[PDB]
Amino acid sequence: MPNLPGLYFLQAYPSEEIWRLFVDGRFWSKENGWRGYESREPGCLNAALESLCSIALQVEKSGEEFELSVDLIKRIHKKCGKKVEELQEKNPGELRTDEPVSFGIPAGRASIKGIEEFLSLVFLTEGGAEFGPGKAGPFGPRFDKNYFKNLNPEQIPDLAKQIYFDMCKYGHSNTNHFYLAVMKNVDVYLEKITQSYNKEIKTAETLDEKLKIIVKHIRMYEVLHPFRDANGRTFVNNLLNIPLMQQGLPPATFYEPNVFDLYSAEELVVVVKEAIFNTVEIIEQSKRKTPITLYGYHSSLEEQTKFRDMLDSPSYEKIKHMDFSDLNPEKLHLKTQKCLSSLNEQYPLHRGAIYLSDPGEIKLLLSNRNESQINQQIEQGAPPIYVGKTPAHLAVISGNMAMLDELIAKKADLSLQDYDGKTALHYAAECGNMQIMGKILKVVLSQEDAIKVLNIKDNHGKTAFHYAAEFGTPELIS
Amino acid sequence: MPNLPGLYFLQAYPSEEIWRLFVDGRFWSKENGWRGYESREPGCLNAALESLCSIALQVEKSGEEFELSVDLIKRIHKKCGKPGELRTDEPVSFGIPAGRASIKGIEEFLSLVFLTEGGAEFGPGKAGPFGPRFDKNYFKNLNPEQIPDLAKQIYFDMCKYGHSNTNHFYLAVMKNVDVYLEKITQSYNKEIKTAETLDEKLKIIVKHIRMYEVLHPFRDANGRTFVNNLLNIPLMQQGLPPATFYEPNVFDLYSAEELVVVVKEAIFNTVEIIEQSKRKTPITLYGYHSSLEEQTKFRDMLDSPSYEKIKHMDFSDLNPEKLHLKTQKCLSSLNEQYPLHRGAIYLSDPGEIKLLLSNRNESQINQQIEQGAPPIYVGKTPAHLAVISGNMAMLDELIAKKADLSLQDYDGKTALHYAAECGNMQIMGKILKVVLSQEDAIKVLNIKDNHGKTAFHYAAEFGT
Ligand SMILES: [Mg+2]
């Protein structure tokens, strides 16, 4: 038997695209893929790759059958925190004791069922964690109200609705609430979660059962937030991939990984599956010598040569150039294909806009669909990228010309705004695609309301042409 | 020992941009500079360069004086064909759109008496599979007393059909081409000796190069032979730089006077090319930002022995500054009539631009230039030209000065149509922000050009 049959997918993953399993897909379009992430903290790209591979290297060939252990976990977060001096806290790879870490969460990174689950985590209650609406400070947030104070667990379903309602009133992408992690017993809870995992994982028989257990526990970790820094990479970009590859699944290439706090375990399974699905299509497209176009980003040959020259990781080289113990580098593949087949099922018009490029397939998919299906906006709980969007919005942000054409043919509503206030037009302007902008405007002008539609403002009070006029000048943070 | 001395400006011309004196400036934006011209005839750039340099190496050498003889004219061609010889009876013809014509130019064309007696044809017609079937030929029973009134009507007729549309055709002379070629040669050498100032000399040079073009003595490559090669010889003989052109194919229906202005700005281009390269300033003329890969591709493709000899020729036997100040004063003619428009084409510095547009009135900022001005200006506002050049700085200041962005040029197109066609999201955005704060926004966005197309029709095609 092997231990990490997943390593197979890691080795198959095309080297010049390996940055994709560390840079969130949401940055690729606007930051020339990996370059923006690289410039904000150079070489973390390697460091992150070196961490995964070196950790996975001392697993697939040791132990008995694997059991998770806190020491491993810490053994992980030793990359990458500062690690530099001086005092008085903390060991650049050790655990928080009383140190307080906090961050905010916008409605678009949350779900009602997710909030319900969050409030239900008992260690947050007894550990002294804080969560609620408030204000962000230079030394912590200032809460207007902390829900973990005097929390009646009978009231959590009603409370979860209210919280979600409040977060939306503030804005889909706006940070209103805040979370301050536990300041008591992190070592205890870290061990509790580890034991829970190793207990439950052994009960699960199917791969879907196992996924549920993996994401449920990875969440608890993240929410637990045991380190001073880099809890997200340490768990979701690194740790999550170990149980995934232990089950013989590929590692995850995420659009937006930062939903392991206020999404529910069930909804996270979906998030991880579509992430996984993304590693599979990366590999397939590269195998078929097809240019990779995911998430509206087209890598230039100069960007690719800059990255492989920059690529530098001994443990990655060892995994790329290894033997194929086997057997089943093809069941491995058929196993994950059956596991991911649950995706196709729900809101396919949106997934089509993201992943489909063949005009014939697209035309077929949109046949027999009604006005409400072609105009459907996906609701809370779906993976972040879908919430509030029509297939049209997603066609524009992917650059899916074929899909946009068919949607226009099917007389889709291009005036509808997603929960950021943006219409298909705001996105076309932001993407700087002259053609898709033109197609949309041709349609908009042949309608009654053309001026009202062109003057639509989003959550920044901006019109589509505000963004258009801004295209190609540089960003402006916070 | 120099004359010709102009060979000084050819050497100064930056090697990796030397294609610019062969590829029309109108192609650069939409054909990645030189690459589109090269792909239609591979090797044609080096052949044109080899022709100019090889022929210029034989002239400065013995001619003292020099003489544009029909022998060198034939030798020029001999280096620009499948073949070196003259036409006898073979018909050669082409069409001309109003935008390549002027009223004064048409007057002059009808006045070329060799076109009347030689049997050349020109009037409204249609394009044939072996020749144009003309509806009228103005050279038949032409009263030369009526040519000023006829020239106005021909121009109006060419405009009714459309600024960029071809209604009128020209079939060249089929009798006595060898005779007329010799007549023009003798006329040139006679008249050039009469002229004293550089402006007088220019008038004579362009007038004769025009006549050489209009008489289409060769089967092929009359343009390359007479305007991209021959024209540069008398120019350099006078100590002027060779000419870089936006659109030069105006040596038929433009007048000699107006062609002087066309050549002056073509020369101005060579001066701006050299200056920008000397200052290490990248080049952004007419809309082509050459990529480093393109430059390397051209540098590797460059291959012309006679060019190499001129690039390493020693012009220590010559005063560059006399030469330089002479062409300086000659070109200081340019930025006077319609100054802005030229600003929109050439100016990139926001400070200079802001200064230039200070205390200009609504009629100056909205001014559309009339027929006879070099092709690129005709019918356009400064705003149109800012958009086609990608002159962001100029467009910004024009918007600040509340320029009218609804005004359409003689192709029916507004600043918006051009922004769509150029595919510039930013300039399109700036324009639309303005248009929507106006009462007439919908009427303006729906403006159709000569092709009945709306700005967004072009936008939706962008990337074809
Ligand atoms: Mg905070």
CSV table of N, CA and C and ligand atoms in Angstrom, one decimal, chain A residues 102-104 136 140-141 178, ligand 1:
chain,number,residue,atom,x,y,z
A,102,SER,N,-6.3,38.6,15.2
A,102,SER,CA,-7.6,39.0,14.8
A,102,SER,C,-7.7,39.3,13.3
A,103,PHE,N,-8.8,39.3,12.7
A,103,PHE,CA,-9.0,39.6,11.3
A,103,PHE,C,-10.5,39.7,11.0
A,104,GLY,N,-10.8,40.2,9.9
A,104,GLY,CA,-12.2,40.5,9.6
A,104,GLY,C,-12.8,39.6,8.5
A,136,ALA,N,-12.0,48.3,13.2
A,136,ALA,CA,-10.7,47.7,13.2
A,136,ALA,C,-9.7,48.8,13.7
A,140,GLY,N,-6.1,46.0,17.6
A,140,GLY,CA,-7.1,45.0,17.8
A,140,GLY,C,-8.3,45.6,17.3
A,141,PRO,N,-9.4,44.8,17.2
A,141,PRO,CA,-10.7,45.5,16.8
A,141,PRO,C,-11.4,45.9,18.0
A,178,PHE,N,-15.6,41.1,12.9
A,178,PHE,CA,-14.2,40.8,13.2
A,178,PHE,C,-14.2,39.7,14.1
C,1,MG,MG,-8.5,43.0,13.1
